[PDB]
Design a protein around this ligand. Structure first.
Ligand SMILES: Nc1nc2c(ncn2[C@@H]2O[C@@H]3COP(=O)(O)O[C@H]3[C@H]2O)c(=O)[nH]1
Length: 124
């Protein structure tokens, strides 16, 4: 799996700009997690410690009745806001089909991903 993860991370513009040794560590520590259609991946208001990169499928993002914000797909990512400052989730993320996410915990994110301009300067 490590090699599959590497080839994938090297294909995503946000992450292909990272040194390959950092990508190798990410591939080492990430957890592959799977969801079915309609499954809540993140709930607004919860406290979070994980970052997600979509490696298969699509998700819907909604936010306080909730309003639809956008859909994200393979190579997109989400969950950074709870890792920036306060740890609260700011929106819901819901699987829109069979989804696989590569999940990175806070310990790894703060060292390997948090300084990336694409992520740190991400605006919606
Ligand atoms: N607050 C907000 N989050 C969004 C939006 N579009 C995608 N997201 C993602 O939805 C995620 C919910 O978890 P986080 O708040 O940690 O991080 C959020 C973002 O990564 C948006 O328009 N507003």
């Amino acid at each position: 799996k490590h090699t599959e993860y590497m080839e994938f991370l090297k294909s995503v513009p946000t992450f292909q700009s990272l040194p390959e040794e950092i990508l190798s560590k990410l591939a080492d520590v990430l957890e592959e997690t799977h969801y079915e259609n309609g499954e809540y991946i993140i709930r607004q208001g919860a406290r979070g410690d994980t970052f997600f990169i979509i490696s298969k499928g699509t998700v819907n993002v909604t936010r306080e009745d909730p309003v639809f914000l956008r859909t994200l797909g393979k190579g997109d990512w989400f969950g950074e806001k709870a890792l920036q400052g306060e740890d609260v989730r700011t929106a819901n993320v819901i699987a829109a089909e069979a989804v696989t996410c590569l999940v990175i915990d806070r310990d790894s994110f703060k060292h390997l991903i948090g300084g990336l301009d694409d992520v740190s300067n991400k605006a919606y």
